[PDB]
Amino acid sequence: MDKNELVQKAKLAEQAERYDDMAACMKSVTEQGAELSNEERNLLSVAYKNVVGARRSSWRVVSSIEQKTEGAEKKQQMAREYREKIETELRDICNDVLSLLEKFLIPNASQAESKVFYLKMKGDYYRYLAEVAAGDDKKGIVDQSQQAYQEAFEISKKEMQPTHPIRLGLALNFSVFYYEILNSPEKACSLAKTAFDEAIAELDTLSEESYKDSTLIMQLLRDNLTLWTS
Amino acid sequence: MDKNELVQKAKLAEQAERYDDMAACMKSVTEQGAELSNEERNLLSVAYKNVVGARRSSWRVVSSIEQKTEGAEKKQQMAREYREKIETELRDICNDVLSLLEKFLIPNASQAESKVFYLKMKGDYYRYLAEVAAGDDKKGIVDQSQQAYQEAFEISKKEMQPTHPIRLGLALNFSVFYYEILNSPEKACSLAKTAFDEAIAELDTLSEESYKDSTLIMQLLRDNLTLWTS
């Protein structure tokens, strides 16, 4: 239960592609209450990304199957129940992250880049909840996502260079929120195009540490733009 | 807990890539005690192949790291401990399958083809145990694997055409057993070459429903042969 040991085990779990183990280690690190280093922060994010990603992918498959089996009630009821079980896992994972975010990560964020990272993450995990939200709760979930993204967005435009990978990654995910959650293609495109164009005009401000991350995100911004406007 | 719903839930889990769920459904089907249809047999086999496969893959990664961290004592002991943890999962999976094979699959096998299939499977899962066995237990585990494969081998040579995918699949895995577990390259090559050549000599015995399986395995046999003799 030592911190450096937990971090090393997390790295080992990542190599082994055992992301449940990875998330458990990094959760334990976070719960010790100290602000996460950049490396620790990224390990936590990678771990939960894979843990929730597996559920998101499974959910899409099963929800799709559920829809296409109308009039075969026994098979559909079976598909529905399985979707709901996956959904419960998914919600528990998102609530796990969102709780760590409220209790430790966002309050301990001393610098702007860290505050943007965590607010972005809060935006993401509410967005994943919104993907599977139905009825009453959806509008509330959607507003929680939007508000976290919006605050991150404003802070990033004030404190970070246009080519900063965290600022670009936020624009990318916030544009996806507009496209997929708010059904506003036009606002999604505007946001993506601006982020891309402002980064393009300043490639000299890239560093050796971030030029690969930043240029990959730019490429994805443009990939999305192309798809959305076809 | 009805059988055909357990089978349909298994098919759903397979689609969702949730192989632990898939295996649990098919384990329950098997434990009902009746002989499996070819479809059920294939679902059970695919489920556990993926369940054990994920652990084997993780084990290779961590074991490799353990080997490359000689002279780095903290990292190596952590790698060892994690490897041991993975091994425990891996042994429990293999022991579940080997128990299903002893209690249900092999005793209920009415046909020569399923007897070869399940004995080969017994060979495989003892081989996966042999991959991670050390010290005292190893030789007994290795002999269990060899004996299951050998009986499978004799039955398949007597009852199945040289081009049968199950007979070819057995030759392939038994050759891998000789190469990787018994460290016997010449016996491995001889076994693989003979299987390949005997299939080539009787391509008239191919059936069109499974000829794609047969020719893929033949290519893998020769791939191994090429690799082992280079």
Next chain:
Amino acid sequence: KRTASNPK
């Protein structure tokens, strides 16, 4: 081709 979000 599908919508992509931030990879890491």
Next chain:
Amino acid sequence: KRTASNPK
């Protein structure tokens, strides 16, 4: 290139 067993 590595040793391969029966794929499924």
